[PDB]
Every structure is written in C-alpha cells, then in structure tokens.
Amino acid sequence: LTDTPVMVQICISLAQGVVYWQPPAQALEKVKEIIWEPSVSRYGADEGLPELREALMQKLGHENNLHKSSVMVTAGANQAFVNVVLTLCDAGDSVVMFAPYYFNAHMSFQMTGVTDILVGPGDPKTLHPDADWLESTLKNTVPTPKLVTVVNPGNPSGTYIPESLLKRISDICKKAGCWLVIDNTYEYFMYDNRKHVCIEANHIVNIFSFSKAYGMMGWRVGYIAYPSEVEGLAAQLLKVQDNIPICASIISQRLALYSMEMGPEWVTNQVKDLVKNREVLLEALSPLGKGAVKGGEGAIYLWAKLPDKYMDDFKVVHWLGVVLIPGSSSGCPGYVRVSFGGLIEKDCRAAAERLRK
Amino acid sequence: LTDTPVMVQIQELIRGNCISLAQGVVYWQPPAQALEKVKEIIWEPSVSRYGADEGLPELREALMQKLGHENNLHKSSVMVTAGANQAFVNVVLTLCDAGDSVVMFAPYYFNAHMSFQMTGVTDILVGPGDPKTLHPDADWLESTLKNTVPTPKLVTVVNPGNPSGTYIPESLLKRISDICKKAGCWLVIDNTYEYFMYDNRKHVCIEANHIVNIFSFSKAYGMMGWRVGYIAYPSEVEGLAAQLLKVQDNIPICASIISQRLALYSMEMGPEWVTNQVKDLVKNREVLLEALSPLGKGAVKGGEGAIYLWAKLPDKYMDDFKVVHWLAKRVLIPGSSSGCPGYVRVSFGGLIEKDCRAAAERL
Amino acid sequence: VLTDTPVMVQIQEAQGVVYWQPPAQALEKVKEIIWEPSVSRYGADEGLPELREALMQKLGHENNLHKSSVMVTAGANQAFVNVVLTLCDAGDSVVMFAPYYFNAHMSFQMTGVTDILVGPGDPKTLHPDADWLESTLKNTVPTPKLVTVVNPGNPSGTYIPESLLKRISDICKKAGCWLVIDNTYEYFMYDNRKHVCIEANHIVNIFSFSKAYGMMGWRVGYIAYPSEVEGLAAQLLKVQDNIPICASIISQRLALYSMEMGPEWVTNQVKDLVKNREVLLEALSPLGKGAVKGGEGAIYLWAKLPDKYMDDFKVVHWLGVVLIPGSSSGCPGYVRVSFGGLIEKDCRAAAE
Amino acid sequence: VLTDTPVMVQICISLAQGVVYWQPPAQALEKVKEIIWEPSVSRYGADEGLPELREALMQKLGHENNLHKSSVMVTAGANQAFVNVVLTLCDAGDSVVMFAPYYFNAHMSFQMTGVTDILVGPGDPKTLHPDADWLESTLKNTVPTPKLVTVVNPGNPSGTYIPESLLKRISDICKKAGCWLVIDNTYEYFMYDNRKHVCIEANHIVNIFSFSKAYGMMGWRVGYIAYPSEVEGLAAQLLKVQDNIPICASIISQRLALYSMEMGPEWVTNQVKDLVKNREVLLEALSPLGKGAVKGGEGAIYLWAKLPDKYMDDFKVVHWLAGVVLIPGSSSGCPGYVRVSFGGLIEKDCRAAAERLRK
C-alpha cells in the first residue's frame, strides 16, 4: 500500500451533521415529471447543467453579493474541495487550517500528498480564527503556504466568521500571495440575527452545498464559485472535474435547480425551528460547567469541553445511549461535538445525555 | 496554479458538434421498468439521506452475486462509486505515490492517463501492443517491470479496450497477472465494456491479491448521467479496505442514493437485457467498417469488443485533431489523445442505423 | 597536428543553475504544438518573429531600451561568440575585469583574440575600476576593440551600480570601443538593489532564458544590438547562419510562452534564494570576516581562502562538497559558491 | 568599427534551400511530448551529449558505417559541428582545400574564423568526383602545407557521391601530406540507384553527421562529430569549443534524435525512395539544357545543371524566374550553373517542374 493514504487519518444519535427535513415536495414533484427525458440519462456538461449554473450565478449575485465568480457544479461539496486542492496545491506544499478544523478537509489535504498542514489557534473566548497568528505565520513560514481554509459558519465549532474578520484574513492572504478557500456549506444556518456574508477576489474560492440547506444529502450536489478572471483556473478545474465525477448526476442537478426555485426563505424558516433544539441540548450540557460549551452562532453544532482528565474522547463516546462526535478528529482532543439539526423534538429524548461525573 | 494539473492534458471536451461518431456511449435508455420504480421512490427519506460510503447494502449484495455468477469472482469485496472514473481515482490515490512509475499500454484510455498525471503520477511508461492484434505486449511488460528501477507500482489495462476496441484473451490476461505478480506490482483492470463482446469472443474476469477490478453502469445500462460504478478489490489484503474508505469518504462520500437504486433495479433485468441489445451493434460495425475502406486494407483494427474501431490515417496526417476538425466542417476522435498520433477512433455504438448516413465519411 | 589557437585556450571547470523548472503553463503549451510542421522546419536566423516582437516589448517596458534590434540565439554563450566574431579580429586586444566570466575568456582565446587586458575590481566591493579602464584605453595603442562586463556578476555576485555603468560606457564612447554587457542574471537582484540596462551605438546587450526561467537545457538567449549602426545586423546575420542557423523552434516557443507569465514569475522564486544565500554564507564563516563577497545579484558568493592555500584546484579536489576554483576567473586563492541550485538540500551542502 | 574577418565573409514555388518535406517520426514526436515535464529535460546536459544518445550513435557508427575507433560528440547541428572542427584544426592564416562545386556554408565558416586562403580543386568534368592527382600535387607543392581538406559525401551542391576507392585515396594522400580530412555525411541516407555510401576512419579523419535532413529534424538542431579516439588531446580541444558555443545541444532535441533513431535507417530510406520520382520529373524539366548539362542524382537531394554558354550570369537568371526559385551556382564557386533541390516538395514538384526554360 501507498505512503500518502496509509498515513491519512481515519440509541438516539447526535453525531453526523444533517437536517431532518426532505427536499421541497414541489421540487421533488417537478423531478417526477422529467425522469424519462433522455437528457436525464446522458452525460451532461462537466461544468454542470447550464440552467443550474445560471440560477447559481443569479443566487451568488443577489444573495451573496458576488459578481466576479464562475460556477462549477460538483458531486458534493466534499468533491468540490478535492477539486480545489488538486488545482491549488502541489504535493509537498504547506497549507493552513484553523482549530477546530473541518475533519474531511484535513484528510483531503493528506490524501493528495499535502501533509504539511499548519493548524492555527482560534480566539480562546470565541473560537474565531486568530488573524494575528495567520498574518505572522504567512510572513514567517518559508516557503509561503499556498492556501488557507476556513468554514463559515464553522464545522465543528458552530461559530461564524464576522464580515470584518473575513476581510482581514482575505487581506492577509492577498499580500502573502496565497489562496483563501471558504466553505459556505452552512450559509443559511445563522442564529441570533448573526450575518453570514460572502466575499470575492482573484485569491478567493468559495464552496457551497445543497446537502444541508435543502436536505439533499443523498443526492450529492454542491458547487464551486471561483474567480472568472484568473487565467487558466477554469481550465485546471475542468481537468480535475472530467477525471473525478465527469459531471454531477443530472437528476440531482435538476432537483437542486427546482429546490432553488422555492427561494432562500424556504430554508431559513426551517432553521428557526432548530433554535429550540439548541436550547434543549445547551441545558443538557450543563454538568460540564458554565463556559464549557461554545457555538450556537451558526451551522448546527455545539462545541463542548469534557472534564480535564477525560482528554480521551473515543472512550467517552463509546461509553455513551446517545452518539456524539469525538473532538480529537478535529484536532482538539478532550472536546466533543453535538449536532442539534437532525432531530424533531425527539431531541428532548436525546437530552438523556446523562453526563454523570 | 499547481503543476500537477497544469501539466495534465486538456480533455476531448473540445467539440465542433454534423452527426457524431465521437463520445462512446450507447443509444438506449436504462430499463423503463427500473426507472419506473425510481420514479416512485423519490419520496423515500432514505433516498435523500447519506448512505454508507461503500454503497447500499442491497446494491453491494446484488453486485456480489453478479461477480460470482457472471465473472466467477469469490474473493472480492465491493465498493459502489459515483462512476468508474472516480473509482479509478480511488485506486490511483490508494495504490500510487506521487513520483512512482506506472505502466499502461498504447493506445490507452485517455482519462486514465490524466488521472495519473492529476495526482502527480507523471512517470507513465507506455508499452506497445502486438503489431497485428494490438493486444498488450506481455514481453515488453516483463522486461520493463524487471529492468525499471524502482519497480512500477501498478499496471493498467482496459478489457475490452477503449479506444482500441480489442479484447484481452483469458490466456494473455493470466500471463500479465503473473508478470505483475512476479514483480510484485498491482494489476488494475477496467471492465466497463464487459457486456460488449462480438463474434463469440469471451470476456473473463480474474482476481488475486494484486488485482483490482473496475466496473461501470454507464455504458451497459445507458445510465451515464446517473453516475454509478464500482470497485472489486481483494478482500484479504490487509488495510486495503481502510484506504479505499478513506478516499471514498473524502471525495463522493457516497454515490447518489437514487442512482444506486436505479442501478440495483436495472441489474434485476439480468445480463441478457444488455447483451441482446449489443447484438444490434454488429450491423453498425459492418457498415462503418466499409466506410473506412479508403484508408487501405489492414488499416482498421478493433470490433472485437466495446463499441470502437481503431483506424490509421496516412503517415503524413500525424496531426489527428486537424483531420477531425476538417471532417466536422465538411465528428471522430483523435488518436493522439490515446498516445497514438496518426490514428482516429470511430464509435459504432451511439447511432441507430443513422450510421448508414455516417457512411458520408468518405475520407 | 592540432591548432595553436585552441591548444592554448584554457581547460574548463559548483555549476551555477536554478532548482526550478520552466513555467508549467509554458511547458503545457509546448506539448500541444509539437505536431506543427513549423516546429520541425528551419526558422528565420534572427529568430521567431513572434518572439523577437515579444522581446522588443520586454526591452522597452522592463529595460527601457528603444534603439535596439533583437537576434535570438541558441544560448547566451553562442550569442557572445557571435559578438566576438563580429566585433573582434584576431590580434586585437580586449578588456575584461577580474574576476571574469570563464567562458567569455576562453571564447576570446578560441577565436585568436589572446591579447586580453584584465582589469582589477575594488578589493572590498569587487566593482570594476573605471579609473584603470580610462587610463588603459587611453594609453594602450592600438585601442582595445571592446570591453566585456557581466551585470550582475559571474562569478562575483556583485552588480554594477548605474552610475559606474554609465561612466564605463562614457569612457568606451570617448575611446571609441565597444561595450558588451551580459545581463544573464538581470532578474536576480537582492536587497532591492537595482539592475539597470543602458543602450548606445557602442553597446551590445546579451540575455539568456536559462537561469531566469530554468530553461537551461533548451538553449535560448538573445542579442540586443544598435539598430542604427550600419552593417552590424548583416555581420551578425553571417555568423548566425554559420553557427546555429537558428535557435531550436520548440525552444523559442517555450521562451515566448514563458515570457507571458511576466518577470514577477521569476522574482518570486528569486526571493526564495535569499534563504539559501544566508545558509551557505554562515557556512563560510571559518574563512574570516569580509572573506566572502557577493550576494548583491546573480546566484554567487565569492570567498577568499586562507593565504597559504593558493591552489584552489587542490582545495576543491579535497572538499564532500564541490565548489568552483576561483583561479578559473583570474583570481587564484579564491573559491566560488552557488546558492541557486539546491532546494533545502542546500543545508546538507553546509557539511563544511 | 566592424571587423575585417566577418565584413570580408560572403553574405513562387521554391526549389532553393533544399529541405525534406517530411516531419520526424510520429512515435518519436509522441514520446518527446510525454517527457517534456521531466526536470532532466530543462537542465544542462553533458557537453559531449546525452549518454544514451552517444551510445546509440556508437552502435550506429559500428553497425551501419563500420566505424569502431571513433568517439561521438553531439552538436546543435552539423553546421555548428563544422565550426567546432574549423576552430580546432585550423588557425587563421592557414590554407585549406575544397572541391568545386563547394558547399557554400563551409566556405563562409572558414572565412568567418579568418581562414581565407581556400584552395578550390577541380572535379572530373563528367562525374564531378574530386581530382585526387590535383590534390596530391597541391598538398606537396603548396608551402606551407594546407591544414585541412573538406568534402561532402554525398555532395552539396553536386548531388554526386564519392566512391569508396576515391575516398580512401584522398585519405592516403592527406595522410602522406600530414593534413586532416573532414567528411560531411549529412546525406548518408540519401543514395540512389543502389549506389553505396561508405564511411572511413583514421587518426587524420573527422566525420560529421546531421539529424536535420534524414529525420526532418531541421528546426530541432542536432548533429554529431565522429572523431579519432586515440589522437592525443583532440577530445580536449573539441570540448573547449563545444563549451564556449553551444555548451550542449538542446536536451529535448537530443531525446527526439534518440527516439527517431529507434525507428531504424529503413524509416528514412523508405522516405528517400519516394524522392526518385521527384528527381526524374525535375530531371525532365532540365531537358532543354543539353546532353551533359545536368550532373548529380547520385545522392543527396540536388541537381546541378550548367546553363547555355551565352547566359553566364547566374544571379539574373534566378531573379528572372517569377516562376520557380532556384539556387545560383556562383555561390558554390561555379558561374554558369544552377542548383535544383528535389527533396522539399510532395509532387507539387511536378507543378514546379512545369515552370521551366524557353531558352
């Protein structure tokens, strides 16, 4: 077996981060009507269904205020991230993530022979990525890291990146001449009127997913909004895209398009029903102490520190009848992740999360 | 931008699309009875949820039975992937390090070549096939593997061939397996066109702890747009399953659930649903074979399997793309992309006796 | 028997190269044009018209040269020979400065130009002594035909400040001899020191693609020579037709495509050599203070051995790292270090 | 201002320059494409050439040319190869020997390096083969002895070859006089009517070869020198000039040369055979000129024709052709003559041989 992957890292449920709702019935209804079209069974353009790309172009402009980005539909945001790594990183290059980091992004770097991953700290009080650390790291790391990855709002932190902070990291990356890769999988999942914002530049690539917003997890559709004016970028993405998925499933792309037509409010109105899921689980995490739990700013995650000697999450998780996610996988051992987006007021039976000590 | 993809070649997405004899797919839709079931299950919550990375237990189980009864495989495990292309990438990332060397045979499958390059596996040793049959030269392989230092990590073959349209006899396949075995390197066989055989030529599958097989639903069942394929890998190779799972979790997570259902329902028709339609392609072959007569007598090879005929242009036309551009204007596939300049690929699987109008190809 | 002129040209030589490949985007463009029949046909002796045009734009926009014609050559080494054969007769005298570029010295000799007047540099800055030059040109009869300089220097690693360069040019103008400037390392400057190019009807500039774009094996260089000097192009054309005929067509293509990345593609990697420079410089600490010169430009450090070891060749044969003996550049007792060719295998070179 | 030595160097369907119409082998161009990414391809090579190519060339010299005492140095063309030899074997002010009609670029290369005393010998009026009797007398009676004798086999511009017997006699003559014999084999693969090209070697002989014509690699710039291994210090001198002028031939070009070679000589000679119909066609267009007016067709790709006695101005007759472009014979030292190249066209050569002389 190969060097590169062998050293790549490996009851009510509160584990995998999903939503409980299905895609829009009216969008599913439109899909029902087109299954016999021959185009649905044929290869589509690698870049995605033209109608879908166009709907996404309009969405990026009017919802995210992006006007200089092109779209490539991918078979998921996870495959979209792989496209970017293979296009923006060489094996042996260095990259920067922030703790706690998105687990699959970490593995995806390693998997493609990018093993020098510099994991920076977040503000101890808010878990927001330390921009001072990054700016100093980029100045003092030789050779300069090729790209920086952040998730806004965060997985697993459940915290978001303020507009001011987001632009500073962007500015830091611009002088240093490296890429900024922002995963917007949870853009529609904001709480307490906190604002998700998107920014663009010839050194910024944004990644999105339909999986959580529209409950289309099993359908596997996501997309890349990349700078239109960066020479040869589109061509490299085409190369990686043709080799891995060729194209996203046509029927999945159709559903994405039809789900989109409901509008953003279809999603955010359902996110509101999750606020009560949060409050229940936050009070269920009371035995841990007063400032032990963070997050609840965005996405669907709560980030909690287990007792000081319990730095071994796997044993704590196995000993629990509720399923949590070990925080060590995100680079922070001794912590644990709680997802409140996947249950329908069966979340209170999930509040059987004993935490006896 | 990164070296590794900047130095992979552009694909044949370039198109002056004229009736086409280019992309190699079939003209038939997936089984209507299987699509009808899919139409009904769109509402199942399980269809919209993430599935197991290795694939639907029902699909995997069905595929196990297929491998046993059709391919005579009994020591292989199954992983459902979102297409045979993503599947091959799983294998490349799992069996190859950047800077390793690998072996292919000319003419080679274009996307397989790029997938190597794409991950920084750029030391690609391209071997010849027997001059009369284009079947991979086992003699070249044996010496190449023995005398190249360090030994190449894996050898890639396509059975039956794209773009050659030739198959690999059971005898040759077993020798190639031995050669890779003696040297201790991997053998990766792409069986995408396993149901596409002609003139009673028989496709066979073999397994070993140094063999990984790849399959696809795209060509056989006309399910191109649904994106389903699978990997049959050795069950007994320690830690192999974990590596494939690592790559699988990072790239597709899983194949589309609805797509896996369609594949599962399509399978239930049985192999004969496919092979009975394949018989109808022979008449397309014979028609197109006469359309390639101006090229000379021994000029055309293939027609043994898949849906391809492989033809040599005159020596002066080593620039295939320009001849292809000139046949659109007044559409074929350039052989240079498969490592063989001066050649051109003709697909007889994509047209329905409009292929006789394709005899408007008088070069 | 063998010939006098090359039997008495000196034997050859560590090697000063860069570790980086040419632009990946330029290499990819080359792959797609290999089938063009023009790539395999003879090209115009003066070079690809498209390339000459791109180089004309570069000279104007980067080097501020506007009175120069361009000729593409198969390397700057062949370009210099063109120049020697065009501007010097055997039996003529020429001027170089110590330490001098080794191959330039041999090229003079090889063509029967053996009366080579080698001037001194300031012992501390290695800058060419312009006072020596003015007095030498005025007092040598007949006047030397041309003066050759390398800016920034091989082997010195020092540059010629704009003020000095213009003075040297003025001296050559009054004396009425040619000035030949080798700008092979124009893109390799440090501490924001300024590389400058100047032009005149008595100046010939030479460039190379080899170091800047890591295109060493491809063999492309060029000459920027005065357009208004009557009959100069024709003489250069004659020598060009006899030696390379033309630079490799595919090599010229790579050069053109590489150019499209812009100078900044080069300088970002050059910046990364500063870390190589400091490492080897401290590895040269046992030799003493001010023992090492250079680091102003190019990719060279120029260091004086202890006084008792005047046989550099013997020290080099002894040293397990390979350096270049400074004797080859007219300066015995010295040794040359190249910090441009290794990628943090450079710290293993610090096994000294 | 400018120097004496180069200032005193000499400066529509085409039948002029003489190239081949074919590109290099498709399999070799494809193999080259696949290694363009290799770092070794962008690095300097050994001055004497790629070891795999030099070894391949050694095998070729032995099995095809029957040479076994020669070393190989790869150059950026045979033209640059010839310059290496001139600077190595000739001093400025020396005298050298060529035969009429002589190869123009060889003549200039002498002049360019200050060798201007170039003694031009006669060829037999019927076959243009070099007169060995004249050579022997000239070498014995010119003081000091000419340093070098240059021949092209088969010939440019004559298109005639030098039989093995004559070649060995010229060699023996140079051996007695103690001068060098330099043989240009650029067209070794271009022989007709089963005439045999032969190579010989000795400590006073240097052979020069090119990939440009045989493999259509003109734009790629590859050639080589086969020189005596046992002559003390010869390799060192050749290394000196090689290091100052090309350093090394382009690596990718050397790779193409190696891969082209693997096709074998028959790949070329099969392409050469297709030129025979071009020869006869152009030969038929030169019919107005007379009985003995045309020479050549023995080798290379050239026809050498004498105009009528009254039209002694070659340059004007060539300009008076627009509409085919020919080469003026005066540049090869023989006024009243004209050169025709039949290697560069694909039976538009008959459209070129349609536009001939009334006179």
DSSP string, B94-125: HH--TT-EEEEESS--HHHHHHHHHTT--EEE
By C-alpha distance, the chain C residue nearest A176 is C268
Continuous segment of H or E residues that includes residue C72 = strand C68-73
Strand order in the sheet with C292-294: C292-294, C300-304, C334-338, C324-325
Residues of C in Cβ contact (< 8 Å) with D33: 31, 34
DSSP state letters, C112-169: T--EEEEE-B-TTT--B-HHHHHHHHHHSSSPPSEEEEESS-TTT-----HHHHHHHH
Cα C104 to Cα B74, B132, C125, D344: the distances in Å are 72, 57, 22, 39
* Residue C23 to residues A96, C15, C32, Cα–Cα distance (Å): 25, 22, 15
Element (H, E) at A12: strand A12-13
Distance CA D227, CA D232 (A): 12
A15 class by beta-carbon count within 10 Å (0-12 exposed, 13-18 middle, 19+ buried): middle
Q: Which residues on D lie below 8 Å from B122 (Cβ)?
A: 37
Closest partner residue to A232 among C25, C268, C275, by Cβ?
C25
CATH architecture of the domain formed by C24-262: 3-Layer(aba) Sandwich (3.40)
Give residues after which chain A gaps, C-N over 2.5 angstroms. Answer: 10, 320
Helix (H) / strand (E) containing C350: none
Residue burial B26-64, b: 16+ Cβ < 10 Å; e: rest: bbbbbbeebbeebeeebeeeebbbebebbbbeebbebbb
List beta partners, residue A96: A118, A148
Structure tokens at D261: 């070679």
B82: which chain A residues are within 8 Å (Cβ-Cβ)? 75, 220, 245, 249
Q: With CB atoms and an 8 Å threshold, state whether C24 touches B6.
A: yes
Taking the C-alpha atoms of residue D168 and residue D165, their distance in angstroms, rounded to an integer, is: 5
Nearest residue in C to A142, CA atom: C272
Among chain B residues, the shortest Cα distance to A219 is held by B256
R_g of chain A computed on alpha carbons: 20
CA distance B230 to B263: 11
- Say if CB C337 and CB C299 are below 8 A apart: no
Provide the β-strand partners of residue B212: B188
Transcribe D192-247 into DSSP letters: -TTPPP-----TTEEEEEESTTTTS-GGG--EEEEEESSSTTHHHHHHHHHHHTTS
Contact C275 A232 (CB under 8 A): no
Contact C21 D4 (CB under 8 A): no
Question: Hey, what amino acid is at A42?
Answer: R
Residue A3: partners with Cβ closer than 8 Å, 6 or more residues away: B97
The residues spanned by each domain of chain C are: 4-16+268-338, 24-262
**Which residues in C have their CB inside 8 Å of a CB on B?**
21, 24-25, 27-28, 31-32, 35-36
B9: nearest CA in chain C? Answer: C28
Per the CB < 8 A criterion, the answer to whether C243 and C254 are in contact is no
Shortest distance, CA B342 to any CA of chain D (angstroms): 7
The CATH number fitting domain C4-16+268-338, selected from 3.40.50.10490, 1.10.510.10, 3.40.50.150, 3.90.1150.10 = 3.90.1150.10
**Quick check: B162 and B24 in contact, CB under 8 A?**
yes
Mutate to test the interface with C, among D212, D221, D259, D260 (most CBs of C within 10 A): D221
CB contact under 8 A, C249 and D220: yes
Residues of C in contact with A142 (CB under 8 A): 272, 275
Cβ–Cβ under 8 Å, residues C93 and C72: no
The dihedral built from the CA positions of residue D268, D269, D271 and D272, taken in this order, carries a sign that is: positive
Q: CA C81, CA C239: separation in Å to the nearest integer?
A: 9
Among A246, A252, A259, pick the best mutation site for testing chain B contact (most B Cβ within 10 A): A246
Give dist(CA A288, CA A284) in Å, integer.
9
Which residues in chain B are closer than 8 Å to C27, comparing Cβ atoms? 7
For the record, the structure tokens of A326 come out as 């070990």
Chains A and B touch (3+ CB pairs under 8 A): yes
Query: Least CA distance to C33: which residue of chain B?
Result: B319
Chain C neighbors of D2, CB-CB under 8 A: 86-87, 231-232, 235
CA distances from A121 to A17, A124, A130, C207 (A): 23, 8, 6, 48
Cβ within 8 Å, pair A143-C268: no
- Smallest Cα distance from D178 to chain B, Å: 49
SS3 A323: strand
- Cβ pair A142:C275 closer than 8 A: yes
3-state class (DSSP) for residue D152: strand
User: What is the CATH code of the structural domain delimited by A25-262?
Assistant: 3.40.640.10
CB atoms within 10 A of CB A21: 17
Integer angstrom CA distances of residue A147 from A82, A122, A239, B323: 13, 18, 20, 42
Asked if chain A contacts chain D via 3 or more Cβ pairs within 8 Å, the reply is no
Nearest residue of A to residue B185, measured between CA atoms? A1
From the list D89, D115, D227, the residue with the least C-alpha distance to C6 is D89
**D72 and D224 Cβ atoms separated by less than 8 Å:** yes
- Residue A329 CB coordination number (10 Å): 20
- Write out the two tokens for A144: 């300069």
Q: In CATH, which of 3.40.640.10, 1.10.3720.10, 3.40.50.300, 2.60.200.20 is domain B32-270? A: 3.40.640.10
> Using CA atoms, how far apart are residues B256 and B262, in angstroms rounded to an integer?
10
- CA C163 – CA C152 distance, rounded (Å): 14
CA distance A302 to A297: 9
CA distance B168 to B141: 15
Subunit partners of chain A (3 or more CB pairs within 8 A): B, C
Strand arrangement of the beta sheet that strand B186-190 belongs to: B76-81, B229-234, B211-216, B186-190, B154-158, B101-105, B123-127
Q: Options 2.40.160.10, 3.90.1150.10, 3.30.70.260, 3.40.50.720; which CATH number does D12-21+270-352 get? A: 3.90.1150.10
Which pair of tokens denotes residue A165? 């902070």
Mutation to test the B interface, candidates A220, A250, A252, most B Cβ within 10 Å: A220
**CATH number of D28-263, picked from 3.30.980.20, 3.40.640.10, 3.40.50.12160, 3.30.470.10:** 3.40.640.10
Rounded CA gap, D148 and D86, in Å? 9
- Determine contact, residues B14/B324, Cβ cutoff 8 Å: no
For residue B314, the chain D residue with the least C-alpha distance is: D26
Tell me the CATH architecture of domain B3-28+275-347: Alpha-Beta Complex (3.90)
Asked whether the beta carbons of residue D87 and residue C246 sit closer than 8 angstroms, the reply is no
B/C Cβ contact: 3+ pairs below 8 Å? yes
State whether B341 and D26 contact (CB < 8 Å): yes
Question: Nearest to residue B187, comparing CAs of B198, B167, B173, B200?
Answer: B173
Distance CA C249, CA A156 (A): 56
Mutation site for A-interface testing, chosen from C20, C21, C25 by largest number of A Cβ within 10 Å: C25
Residue with tokens 């000419």: D146
Which of B122, B316, B341 is the closest to D30 by Cβ? B341
Q: Which residues of chain C neighbour D45 with C-beta distances below 8 Å?
A: 217
How many Cα atoms are found within 13 Å in the side-chain-facing hemisphere of B106?
A: 19
Bridge partners for D325 per DSSP: D14
User: Cis link prior to B163 (omega < 30° from 0)?
Assistant: yes
Q: Which of B2, B9, B319 lies closest to C35 in CB terms?
A: B319
Which among D320, D318, D321 has a CA at the least distance from the CA of D329? D318
Nearest residue on chain B to A255, alpha-carbon basis:
B42
Taking alpha carbons only, the member of D118, D121, D122 closest to residue D109 is: D118
- Is the Cβ pair B336, C35 closer than 8 Å? yes
Amino acid in the structure at residue B349 = G
Distance CA B228, CA A20 (A): 26
The Cα-based distances of D284 to A297, B360, D289 in angstroms read 93, 41, 10
Q: Please provide residue D264's backbone torsions phi and psi, each rounded to the nearest 5 degrees.
A: 95, 160
Q: What chain D residue is nearest to B122 in terms of C-alpha separation?
A: D37
* Cβ(D54)–Cβ(D46) below 8 Å: no
D265/D276 Cα distance (integer angstroms): 18
In 3D space, the residue among C20, C22, C73 whose CA is nearest the CA of residue C207 turns out to be C73
* Residues found in chain C: 352
Chain D contact set for C8 (CB, 8 A): none
Q: Who among A3, A216, A245 is closest to B82 (CB)?
A: A245
How far apart are alpha carbons A127 and A123 in whole angstroms?
5
List the one residue out of D212, D248, D108 whose CA is nearest residue C237: D108
Alpha carbons A329 and A105: distance in angstroms, whole number: 11
Q: What technique determined this structure?
A: X-ray
Residue A32 makes CB contacts below 8 A (sequence gap 6+) with: B39, B42
- CA–CA gap between residue A96 and residue A104 (Å, rounded): 14
Burial label for B140, CB within 10 Å (0-12, 13-18, 19+), is: middle
Tokens of D259: 């891969």
Integer-rounded Cα Rg, in Å, for chain B is 20
C41/D19 touch (CB, cutoff 8 Å), yes or no: yes
Q: How far apart are CA A77 and CA A206, in angstroms?
A: 10
Q: Which residues contact D83 (CB under 8 A, 6 or more apart)?
A: C242, C243, D109, D112, D113, D241, D245
Indicate the residue of B7, B10, B318 with minimum beta-carbon distance to C27: B7
Q: Which of A66, A56, A83 is nearest to A256 (CA)?
A: A56
Resolution (A): 2.0
Element (H, E) at C199: none
Burial class (CB in 10 A: 0-12, 13-18, 19+), C261: middle
In one-letter notation, the amino acid at residue D267 is W
A177 contact residues in C (CB cutoff 8 A) = 268
Shortest alpha-carbon distance between residue B45 and chain A (Å): 7
Provide the pairing of β-strand C115-119 with C93-97: parallel
Strand-by-strand arrangement of the D205-210 sheet: D70-75, D223-228, D205-210, D180-184, D148-152, D95-99, D117-121
Nearest to D155 by CA among D95, D197, D114, D115: D197
Q: What is the DSSP string of A44-84?
A: --TT--HHHHHHHHHHHHHTS---SEEEEEES-HHHHHHHH
Interface test with A, best of B42, B48, B96, B114 (most A CBs within 10 A): B48
Residues in chain A closer than 8 A to B47 (CB atoms): 218-219
Q: Contact C214/D42, CB-based, under 8 Å?
A: yes
Find the chain B residues whose C-beta atoms sit closer than 8 A to any C-beta of C: 1-3, 6-7, 9-10, 318-319, 336, 341
Tokens of C275: 């870390």
